[model samples]
Target: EEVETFAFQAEIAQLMSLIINTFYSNKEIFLRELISNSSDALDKIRYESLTDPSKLDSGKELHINLIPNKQDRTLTIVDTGIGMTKADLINNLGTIAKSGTKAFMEALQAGADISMIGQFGVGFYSAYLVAEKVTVITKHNDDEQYAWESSAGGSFTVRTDTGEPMGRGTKVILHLKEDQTEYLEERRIKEIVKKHSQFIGYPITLFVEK
Candidate 1:
């Protein structure tokens, strides 16, 4: 309840309007984009552990978990990968890109497939296609756990996480729009993952809290 707040710059806000209003067509691509980013996050931890073995102190397998809560009308994707710090939450979520906003949009419009979402870095924002609000809970080995939230309202907030317990990694939760509840369906999520993230290196499990 005591979170610090921040607002995006004018230019970035305008660009966000363009991305939500015109750039993304297939709403389902949001899953592909998020999972792909998770794959990349997981890869980073493994790569770094090669040099500093201490990075793997968690002893948890690198994997992704897709948890759907129809009751809450939310879809959460969790990854046991290298997580983000408060600075990262401020920078990565607050500003999609430092200077390539134009270049990134240009490339997307130039026929770049959705699979390259990580390259342009706008994948995270795609959540607005179906979510009215998005919340990111992450814990980096070097920083305390925190939650970053936004409604794609050109502003965001961050605070110490106090909801569910989390290990070292990132957990992104999308609050589905009234009409976007279809994403919380089990069959639909499976289809999206099967079609798009089929070849991702990490194992994506259906996370159930029993």
Candidate 2:
């Protein structure tokens, strides 16, 4: 597969840095934030499918799976939901959408409601709190499968994936840092997911050794 590298928009790079350094106190909430994103993706498909069932493949189950690998020091979260296209990746990952990062920061300074930060669309950057790198593999019905990789220290690269198909969904890989050991443990992840996402509509499963 051919690969292309691109620099993040200046505004988004600044937002990513601010998210990483300023949100240290709530580091474990990364899982909650990501799960919320996946849940939204799932809800989107269900909503769209009401009028056009073809948008969602028949006999497909909507769920989220967490696979933690001790050897690789990585945690992979897979969601069977409405995946993003290349354009979506560029807008969502490479740039800050909606109100823009500057407005979000300014509102934070003015003490905006903490619960409304996700509406500003910077929740995904929370991944960097515990990970040195993040990779996203996503497949949308209207677009070809693609992968996006970033270190959040600077720029990010996006490329087409000729590897295994994702069917219809997204997979996020978090390369855990040395100090982020708690996230790699099954029990800790289960506890966090249950505490924050138990009421979510979709099923959430954490992989374990048989």
Candidate 3:
């Protein structure tokens, strides 16, 4: 695999530890937040389809699925939404403020309130609360399929995927930490989804063992 690695901006890297420690009262909201993002992606496509139906060329139903693997201690969430390109992956995961790194530093030094969470675009980094690592496999209409891997430990890697293509969408695989096993339970997952994403526009399904 030809991989390209990039370090998170200094302000983001420093904020990672702080966000994981102090921001969220409940770590499970990570799923809600991710699903919310996926919902946004799905909405984007639905809106664009108004102008160009080709945007939904794959003919796949707009949906989200959560599959938990106990053996590997991994929980994967897949979404048939507008996926990302290489640039999108880097811009989304690597930085907080698109304006510049200096603005981020200024806010951090000024003791910005934790309530200002998503303003900096660190919502995805919340996955670090439960997973030791996260792997995002995505395929965008205008770009080839690629895999994005990160530990939220200052850096992340992006590379071409040799595996089967996802067709068109995103798959987020969370390698759960030992203490985060509760997230793998179907009942727990159902509860979380019901609590946070029950009203999501798309169908959100859970894949549990038969």
Candidate 4:
């Protein structure tokens, strides 16, 4: 007979529930999270370009991509940033940091502003806000490409890819909910970008219909 077992770190269950419930109620803030992630990626490239000019070889055209498919009710946001290593993805998504999650929740409960609520280390989990399932395809500069998928059920799966390992960036596919279909419109999405990320450090493009 063969057996499959699953185990969780101490307090992992408690912390995940806390994370999903209280992270952001307004939901639009998921856009803010995605933008913040994009900002992080741009910042990484900007810093790396200082020493390894080859990295900036993507030319001066650093950008993010937002594609919303109305037919499937899905949205994908991609960024050419410092993508994650396999170890990074595992440690960040699979494991629960008891201390980190606790401190973040405390600050959040104690009126800590969003800016100061840094370092919870689970920004990717924000996709659960509007998605039933999410597939993240990422390629790091030095390592092979990888894919991550999750339902925000407190666990995720990771797999390696030979798909060009992407080209120094990430593409996030959001399986949006039915009521959230408005995000599939180009004009609405463009408005959201201009409202939130117009002054962002990089170009953000929306793939829309003619």
- TM-score of candidate 4 to 2 decimals: 0.79
- Rank all candidate structures by their lDDT, best first, as comma-separated numbers: 2, 1, 3, 4
Task: Choose the strongest candidate by lDDT.
Answer: 2
Q: For candidate 3, lDDT tens digit of each residue in 134-205?
A: 999988888999999988778889999988877788899999989899999999999999997889989988
Question: lDDT tens digits, residues 90-127, model 4?
Answer: 66532345666677668778886443433565455556
State which candidate, 1 or 4, has the greater TM-score. 1
- What are the per-residue Cα lDDT tens digits for candidate 2 across 95-161? 3554566677788789884345566777787788788899999998889999999988677788998
TM-score of 2: 0.91
Worst 10 residues of 4 by lDDT: 1-10
lDDT to native, each model: 0.80, 0.81, 0.80, 0.68
Worst 10 residues of 3 by lDDT: 93-102
**Candidates ranked, most accurate by TM-score first:** 2, 1, 3, 4
- Backbone clashes under 3 angstroms, per model: 0, 0, 0, 0
Q: Which stretches of candidate 3 lie over 4 Å from their true place?
A: 21-25, 93-116
What are the runs in model 1 whose C-alpha is more than 4 Å off?
23-25, 94-96, 108-117, 208-210
Which model, 2 or 3, shows the larger lDDT?
A: 2
Quote the positional error of residue 81 for candidate 1 in Å. 0.8
Off by over 4 Å in 4: 1-25, 57-60, 93-100, 112-121, 162-165
Screening candidate 1 with a backbone cut-off below 3 angstroms (N, C-alpha, C), the clashing residue pairs are none
Q: Name the candidate, 1 or 3, with the larger TM-score value.
A: 1
